[PDB]
Amino acid sequence: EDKIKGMFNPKIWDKTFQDGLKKEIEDSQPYNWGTIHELVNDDLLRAVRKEIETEIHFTKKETDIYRVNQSGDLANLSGLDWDDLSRLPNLFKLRQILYSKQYRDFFGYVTKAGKLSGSKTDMSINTYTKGCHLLTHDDVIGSRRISFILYLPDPDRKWKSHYGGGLRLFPSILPNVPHSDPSAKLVPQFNQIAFFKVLPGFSFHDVEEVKVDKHRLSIQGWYHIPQVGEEGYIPGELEDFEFPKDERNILSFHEVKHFEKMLKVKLSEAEFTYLSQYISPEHLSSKGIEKLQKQFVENSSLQIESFLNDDKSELLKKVIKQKELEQECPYHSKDVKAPWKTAIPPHKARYLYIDGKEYRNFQTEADILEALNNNDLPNFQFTKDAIKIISDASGNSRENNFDAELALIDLAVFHKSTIFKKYLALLTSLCPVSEQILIRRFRPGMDFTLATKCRFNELLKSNPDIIDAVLEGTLCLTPSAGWESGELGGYELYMMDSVLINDPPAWNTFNLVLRDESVLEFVKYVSWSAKSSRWDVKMKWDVKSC
Ligand SMILES: O=C(O)c1ccnc(C(=O)O)c1
Ligand SMILES: [Mn+2]
């Protein structure tokens, strides 16, 4: 109990240091946080690092929100037992000093956090290697009160910014609506600690992907609200902001009656002619249709390869590749321009999309409230019109042309056609009654979605004819290679609340899934190492049985 203070940098016991740090935390941005360099006795932390590397077996784990080499999953033999640190005596001592009354008095003082539990120790040890990442979250769980991360990269080398693995903090547009882009990034060194009071609606942060073949070790922890009576402690002494909305617009009665009439291969020569403008002959034949029909009957899903015909395939591949190679992709939401929008908020998703609605760029609360007071509906031809006029002005250079947006919008218009929906009804024996179409681009090192269920149309819940499912299509147009292992991310994942579909990005594929209430779906974060964005067209429909 005497040697505890001496196991820290002596500056933290200095009144001048403490008061200075308290003020720095008070006045920090974008929410209250701070950092201390050279926190712990150097020999102790060096010994901890050596113990960890020697004694702990790390296991890669990937979910929608992270990829990390973990040690924490118990019931798996490699799982770290915090009740048995027999062989990690230095780690045992590190935990002891961090949760000591002496340190908690200091730390609670400078963070203005109030009392902190000494008995509720809560730490975990993780390494990040190339491709590892942890996407946006606020740490708000149970009795967590202060978050800290102590960093243990190689003590004899500087960790460089371009290595990645930075701790990024996100400012607040309004409570529970973090800005899509971070406003600060800490590049951590050995024996540096970062920390922040856990703040519902505000303490949003992530860990930037590690971009090089290095290992970075960290020890993440929390201080908790004390146990009742612990050291005297006495207890007590949003959908609206998501864009795009998971909402569909109902179809005209003309369309719905068309589909019913057909279901109660009744496609005309003229309709096949229209469908063959975009779709491969293989999938318009009597046999191809029969195969797809049976596959959907047996699986309630379809995974079609070479969906579009060669003409539209060649066109789209050219213009997408050209845009990838010769134009500057925006990498901040402020830089995104019509016809594109940024999906928000970043603790739910981040990607670029074209929805056909009037342009929005959400930098301020006022920008959001303006959109919510003035809801508008998609119109893809007007979006085309607007592009053409921006395009003519600048000139349509190799570096500014909208060739890819125009082709993609044309493709969206095809899927918006009454005849395509007739084809869809033919394949599925379902009658679409609503639609939402989005063109999406997932940039390397930025974009992703997280695991969510479909959103039923509330107004239609009482309708017996309408199936309790959402039909969802994905037309992938990703022309780059290297995705097959899933290691570059970008894979489309459908799973039950076991995996139904795990499809890395590929060129010219069409996935179709009839989702019941409990099916989860996401597109995994695209690695910085990916050779292009993931490009796709997303389609959703409410359906009734005929
Ligand atoms: O392990 C980390 O470095 C880390 C950083 C930020 N957040 C977490 C977390 O688990 O909340 C962990
Ligand atoms: Mn965290």
Beta bridge pairs of residue 302: 512
Query: Atom 11 of ligand 1 has which residue's CA nearest to it?
Result: 139
Other CB atoms within a 10 A radius of the CB of residue 347 amount to 19
Alpha-carbon distance values, 190 to 155, 207, 218, 303, 399 (Å): 5, 16, 9, 48, 43
Q: What topology does CATH give the domain 238-546? A: Double-stranded beta-helix (3.60.130)
The pair phi, psi for residue 99, each rounded to 5°, is -105, 10
The pair phi, psi for residue 207, each rounded to 5°, is -115, 115
For residues 404-425, one letter each, b for 16 or more C-beta atoms within 10 angstroms of the residue's C-beta and e for the rest, the string is bbbbbbbbbbbbbbebbbbbbb
Query: Rounded to an integer, what distance in angstroms lies between the CA atom of residue 532 and that of residue 120?
Result: 45
Neighbouring residues of the ion ligand 2, judged by CB less than 5 Å:
139
Eight-state DSSP code of residue 491:
-
Task: Retrieve residue 53's tokens.
Answer: 């590397």
The answer to whether the annotation marks 494 as part of a ligand binding site is no
Ligand nearest to the CA of 193: 1
> Is the C-alpha dihedral spanning 253, 258, 262, 264 positive or negative?
positive
Task: Retrieve residue 405's tokens.
Answer: 């947006």
Query: Rounded to an integer, what distance in angstroms lies between the CA atom of residue 94 and that of residue 489?
Result: 36
> Is the C-alpha dihedral spanning 188, 194, 199, 202 positive or negative?
negative
The pair phi, psi for residue 534, each rounded to 5°, is -80, 120
Ligand 2 centroid to Cα of residue 321, in Å, is: 37
Dihedral through CA 41, CA 47, CA 53, CA 58, nearest 10?
-50
Place of tokens 């990838």: 324
Ligand 1 proximity of 139 Cβ (cutoff 6 Å): yes
Place of tokens 């701790």: 167
Q: How was this structure determined?
A: X-ray
Q: Which of 218, 198, 196, 192 is nearest to 207 (CA)?
A: 218
Q: Which of 456, 420, 458 is nearest to 537 (CA)?
A: 420
Burial label, 55 (beta-carbon count in 10 A; 0-12, 13-18, 19+): middle
**Cis check: omega of the bond before 339, within 30 degrees of 0:** yes
Ligand nearest to the CA of 127: 1
- Spatial contact of 148 and 223, defined as CB atoms under 8 Å apart: yes
- Spatial contact of 338 and 393, defined as CB atoms under 8 Å apart: no
Q: Which of 453, 454, 522 is nearest to 493 (CA)?
A: 522
Q: Within 13 Å of residue 95, how many CA atoms lie on the same side as its CB? A: 20
**Cis check: omega of the bond before 30, within 30 degrees of 0:** yes
Query: Rounded to an integer, what distance in angstroms lies between the CA atom of residue 380 and that of residue 409?
Result: 7
Query: Atom 8 of ligand 1 has which residue's CA nearest to it?
Result: 220
Dihedral through CA 195, CA 197, CA 201, CA 206, nearest 10?
10
The residues, any chain, with a CB within 8 Å of residue 182's CB and separated by 6 or more, are 168, 169, 170, 206
Ligand 1 centroid to Cα of residue 352, in Å, is: 26
The pair phi, psi for residue 167, each rounded to 5°, is -85, 120
Query: Rounded to an integer, what distance in angstroms lies between the CA atom of residue 120 and that of residue 145?
Result: 11
Ligand 1 proximity of 203 Cβ (cutoff 6 Å): no
3-state secondary structure string across 298-316? HHCEEEEECCECHHHHHHH
The answer to whether the annotation marks 133 as part of a ligand binding site is no
Query: Rounded to an integer, what distance in angstroms lies between the CA atom of residue 525 and that of residue 65?
Result: 8
Please compute Rg for the chain using Cα positions: 27
- Spatial contact of 491 and 523, defined as CB atoms under 8 Å apart: yes
Ligand 1 atom showing the smallest separation from residue 206 Cα: 6
Query: Rounded to an integer, what distance in angstroms lies between the CA atom of residue 75 and that of residue 383?
Result: 54
The H or E element containing residue 524 is: none
Ligand 1 atom showing the smallest separation from residue 219 Cα: 1
Residue type, 134: L
Pocket test for ligand 1, best of 207, 208, 217, 222 (most atoms within 8 A of CB): 207
Task: Retrieve residue 234's tokens.
Answer: 């006495």
Query: Rounded to an integer, what distance in angstroms lies between the CA atom of residue 120 and that of residue 144?
Result: 10
3-state secondary structure string across 51-105? HHHHHCCCEEEECCCEEEEECCCCCCCCCCCCCCCCCCHHHHHHHHHHCCHHHHH
The residues, any chain, with a CB within 8 Å of residue 316's CB and separated by 6 or more, are 308, 404, 407, 408, 411, 477, 508
Pocket test for ligand 1, best of 70, 129, 134 (most atoms within 8 A of CB): 134
Q: For 236-239, which contacts have Cβ atoms below 8 Å and span 24 or more sequence positions?
A: 238/176, 238/177
Ligand 1 centroid to Cα of residue 59, in Å, is: 16
- Spatial contact of 453 and 518, defined as CB atoms under 8 Å apart: yes
Dihedral through CA 253, CA 464, CA 520, CA 303, nearest 10?
-60
Ligand 1 centroid to Cα of residue 205, in Å, is: 9
Ligand 2 centroid to Cα of residue 87, in Å, is: 28
Task: Retrieve residue 402's tokens.
Answer: 């909208």
Q: Which bin fits 139, alpha (ψ -120 to 50), beta or left (φ > 0)?
A: left
The answer to whether the annotation marks 350 as part of a ligand binding site is no
Query: Rounded to an integer, what distance in angstroms lies between the CA atom of residue 262 and that of residue 273?
Result: 18
The residues, any chain, with a CB within 8 Å of residue 311's CB and separated by 6 or more, are none
DSSP string for residues in 381-428 = HHHHHHHHHHHHHH---TTT--HHHHHHHHHHHHHTSHHHHHHHHHHH
The pair phi, psi for residue 474, each rounded to 5°, is -140, 115
Query: Rounded to an integer, what distance in angstroms lies between the CA atom of residue 444 and that of residue 482?
Result: 13
Query: Rounded to an integer, what distance in angstroms lies between the CA atom of residue 140 and that of residue 263?
Result: 50
Query: Rounded to an integer, what distance in angstroms lies between the CA atom of residue 427 and that of residue 265?
Result: 9
Ligand 2 centroid to Cα of residue 204, in Å, is: 8
Strand 33-36 and strand 66-70: the pairing is unpaired
Query: Atom 12 of ligand 1 has which residue's CA nearest to it?
Result: 220
The answer to whether the annotation marks 163 as part of a ligand binding site is no
- Spatial contact of 207 and 133, defined as CB atoms under 8 Å apart: yes
The residues, any chain, with a CB within 8 Å of residue 268's CB and separated by 6 or more, are none
Query: Rounded to an integer, what distance in angstroms lies between the CA atom of residue 27 and that of residue 29?
Result: 7
Q: Which of 543, 522, 545 is nearest to 470 (CA)?
A: 543
Q: Is 1-237 a domain of CATH 2.60.120.620?
A: yes
Place of tokens 């960093």: 151
Eight-state DSSP code of residue 361:
-
Burial label, 235 (beta-carbon count in 10 A; 0-12, 13-18, 19+): exposed
Task: Retrieve residue 164's tokens.
Answer: 């990645």
Query: Rounded to an integer, what distance in angstroms lies between the CA atom of residue 290 and that of residue 22?
Result: 71
| Sequence spans of domains, the chain | 1-237, 238-546
Query: Atom 1 of ligand 1 has which residue's CA nearest to it?
Result: 220
Q: Which of 388, 144, 119 is nearest to 231 (CA)?
A: 119
Pocket test for ligand 1, best of 66, 149, 193, 199 (most atoms within 8 A of CB): 149
Eight-state DSSP code of residue 325:
H
Query: Rounded to an integer, what distance in angstroms lies between the CA atom of residue 294 and that of residue 285?
Result: 14
The pair phi, psi for residue 424, each rounded to 5°, is -60, -45
Ligand 1 proximity of 220 Cβ (cutoff 6 Å): yes
- Give the distance from CA 151 to its chain's centroid: 25
Residue type, 7: M
Ligand 2 centroid to Cα of residue 515, in Å, is: 31
**Cis check: omega of the bond before 244, within 30 degrees of 0:** yes
Task: Retrieve residue 458's tokens.
Answer: 């509330």
Alpha-carbon distance values, 16 to 24, 101, 108, 112, 474 (Å): 12, 20, 16, 16, 60
Other CB atoms within a 10 A radius of the CB of residue 172 amount to 19
| DSSP-derived 3-state class of residue 492 | strand
Pocket test for ligand 1, best of 80, 126, 133, 159 (most atoms within 8 A of CB): 126
Query: Rounded to an integer, what distance in angstroms lies between the CA atom of residue 64 and that of residue 134?
Result: 9
Query: Rounded to an integer, what distance in angstroms lies between the CA atom of residue 353 and that of residue 533?
Result: 12
DSSP string for residues in 112-143 = T-----SS---EEEEEE-TT-EEEEE----TT
DSSP string for residues in 242-300 = -BS-S--EEPPHHHHHHHHHHH-----HHHHHHHTTTB-GGGTSHHHHHHHHHHHHHHS
Task: Retrieve residue 491's tokens.
Answer: 């894979």
Query: Rounded to an integer, what distance in angstroms lies between the CA atom of residue 386 and that of residue 402?
Result: 11
Ligand 1 proximity of 428 Cβ (cutoff 6 Å): no
Burial label, 209 (beta-carbon count in 10 A; 0-12, 13-18, 19+): buried
Task: Retrieve residue 322's tokens.
Answer: 């050209």
Terminus-to-terminus CA distance in the chain, angstroms?
77
- Spatial contact of 24 and 112, defined as CB atoms under 8 Å apart: no
Ligand 1 atom showing the smallest separation from residue 137 Cα: 11
Helix (H) and strand (E) counts for the chain?
Answer: 12, 28
Query: Rounded to an integer, what distance in angstroms lies between the CA atom of residue 223 and that of residue 197?
Result: 9
Eight-state DSSP code of residue 359:
P
Ligand 1 centroid to Cα of residue 149, in Å, is: 7
Task: Retrieve residue 426's tokens.
Answer: 């033919």
Residue type, 359: Y
Ligand 1 centroid to Cα of residue 148, in Å, is: 8
Ligand 2 centroid to Cα of residue 366, in Å, is: 29
Strand 352-354 and strand 205-207: the pairing is unpaired
The answer to whether the annotation marks 37 as part of a ligand binding site is no
Ligand 1 proximity of 126 Cβ (cutoff 6 Å): yes
Query: Rounded to an integer, what distance in angstroms lies between the CA atom of residue 122 and that of residue 144?
Result: 9
